[PDB]
């Protein structure tokens, strides 16, 4: 790609594993069944962009920016988000993931306010010092994914299953949670559920 | 019922004896049983209760000052309003000293006692009040708990599998190790402000 600005294109089907992307700006375009295992997006300008049935195993981003991005059936493992660059002016719903795989990703200390992490498997990602309001895990599996000091104020767990947030360290005020995985809240408390 | 005359009696059996309001003072009862006996407000005054079993008795109101109950198993009783802070508690600090099963207990004092291993199972346990009381290990299996207050109740290992319209608050109490069952066990959640569905 010799071109810094993109708008309005369809990449399709394209292979670009490995390959490192800088410094480009794409606006409205979308990405879909394209490969970009272990690529690199160095300093990049995502802006109302989508990713639909793409693979970004292990993808790096550091420096590169997104905003308005969605991720749609997209393999997405291992990305550490924390060296993305992110604004000091914070905004709502900035990104959003349906039916992705997101296991062992970093989200560590950063601002997801109202973000969809929805019906996205979501194994042993790291959720640490984030901000999660109004977030939203409808029908998310969260199996081994760490919250610690993590808000999750206003947040949707809805028929999600396997998370684990101890109360004690967590803020969950006006959450919502759907029985009967709902009364694993209770395991901060070392109750015997049966 | 003809007025006890001894303060001792052992191995014996008292059946459909009506002693409603007698009053009974200082008598030791070792492995006996009362079946079928009216005690409604008897005063049991500094007696002692060892290795007994009361079955189908109404002790409704009975008032228990410095009366002691050890290896006391009540069944099918009626017990109604009874102050149990006033009777004798041991020093001696042993688990299981007290069993109830299909019970009334309704309206009865347990506040600040020691009651750990305490059965209470398939009784009717309304508006009872167990502040501050130690249940350690206090089986609840399929008791009804409506009204009833649990206000820092030592619950730790307690066993309330099957029961209902038990009010816990969770942040109130000891509950670690406590054991509950779903649906009912939804109800500690209550503790939290979350939206549930």
Redesign the interface.
């Known amino acids: 790609l010799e071109s810094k600005d993109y708008c309005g294109e369809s990449f399709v089907s394209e292979d670009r594993s490995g390959q490192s992307l800088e410094s480009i700006r794409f606006e409205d375009c979308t990405f879909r069944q394209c490969n970009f295992t272990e690529a690199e997006l160095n300093r990049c300008k995502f802006r109302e962009c989508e990713f639909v049935d793409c693979n970004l195993s292990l993808i790096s981003i550091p420096q590169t920016s997104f905003m308005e991005v969605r991720f749609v059936d997209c393999k997405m493992l291992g990305v550490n988000w924390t060296s993305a660059q992110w604004p000091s002016v914070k905004m709502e719903g900035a990104l959003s993931f349906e039916r992705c795989i997101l296991n062992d990703s970093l989200f560590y200390g950063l601002y997801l306010a109202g973000v969809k992490m929805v019906e996205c498997r979501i194994h042993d990602a790291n959720f640490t010092e984030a901000d999660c309001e109004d977030a939203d895990f409808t029908q998310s599996d969260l199996k081994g994914s760490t919250f610690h000091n993590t808000k999750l104020t206003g947040a949707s767990f ?1 028929d999600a299953v396997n998370y684990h947030i101890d ?1 004690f360290h967590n803020d ?9 995985e ?2 694993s ?2 395991n901060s ?6």
């Open positions: 809805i109360i969950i005020k006006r959450a919502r949670f759907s029985l009967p709902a009364a809240l209770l408390l070392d109750i015997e559920l049966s």
